[PDB]
Amino acid sequence: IASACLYIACRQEGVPRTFKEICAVSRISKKEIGRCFKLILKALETSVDLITTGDFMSRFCSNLCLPKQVQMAATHIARKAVELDLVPGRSPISVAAAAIYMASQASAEKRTQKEIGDIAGVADVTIRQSYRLIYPRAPDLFPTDFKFDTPVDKLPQL
């Protein structure tokens, strides 16, 4: 109950922590945390605004030691991908991880799929799927006023 309440408090304060992030600090599994989360929402007759890709960009990039320009590019890429519906049904955390990977690979500070998955709580396979979905539209997703250490046409393909 306490872990689910902590998750709900983060969502209500507008700095959501993923269920995996809460589980990493709670002995309670993510499954039970989600069960208690839904039960608490029903009991309190309250609601939490749907999370977005930009809700985790700051934390993920800061934990990855990525520059502010890289963080901005990742946020723009994720928001543009969601707007264009390039990743329909994909989890916002997975989309954010894929966008962070794209921006990091396009910037000098390059972070591996394993690293991004470790910080974001998303498997490298899921990051690969999302990055494959968003890769074709990389030049459109990237911000107009962005400096590419590695040209967009030479981004990793996989």
Partner 1 sequence: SGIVPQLQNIVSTVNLGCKLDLKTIALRARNAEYNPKRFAAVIMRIREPRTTALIFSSGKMVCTGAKSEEQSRLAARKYARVVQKLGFPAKFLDFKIQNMVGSCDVKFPIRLEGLVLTHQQFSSYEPELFPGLIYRMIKPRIVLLIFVSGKVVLTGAKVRAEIYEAFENIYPILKGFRK
Partner 2 sequence: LDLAGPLLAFLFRGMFKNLLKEVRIYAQKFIDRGKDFNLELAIKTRIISDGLKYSLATGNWGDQKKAHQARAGVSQVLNRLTFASTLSHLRRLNSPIGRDGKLAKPRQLHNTLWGMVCPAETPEGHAVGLVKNLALMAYISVGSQPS
Partner 3 sequence: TNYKPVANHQYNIEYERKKKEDGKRARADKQHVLDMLFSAFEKHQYYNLKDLVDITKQPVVYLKEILKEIGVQNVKGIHKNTWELKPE
Spatial CA neighbour of 100 closest among 127, 126, 123, 82: 127
User: Which of the choices partner 3, partner 1, partner 2, none does residue 85 contact, using the CB cut-off of 5 to 8 A by kind?
Assistant: partner 1
Site for partner 2 in 18-47 (CB under 8 A): 24-27
- The reply on whether position 26 binds partner 1 by CB under 8 A is no
Closer residue to partner 1, CB minimum distance, 89 or 151: 89
Residue 89 carries which side chain, given as an amino acid letter? Answer: G
Q: Which region among 31-39, 60-68, 124-132, 142-150 touches partner 1 (by CB under 8 A)?
A: 31-39
Cβ at position 150, least distance to partner 3 in Å? 26
Decide if 75 contacts 101 (C-beta within 8 A).
Answer: no
Angle between helices 92-106 and 68-84 (to 10 degrees): 130
Decide if 59 contacts 66 (C-beta within 8 A).
Answer: no
Could you tell me which residues come within 8 angstroms of residue 36 by beta carbon, excluding any fewer than 6 positions away? Answer: 1, 3, 4, 28
**Chain positions contacting partner 2, by CB under 8 A:** 24-27
> Residues interacting with partner 1, by CB under 8 A?
18-19, 34, 37-38, 41, 47, 50-51, 85, 88-93
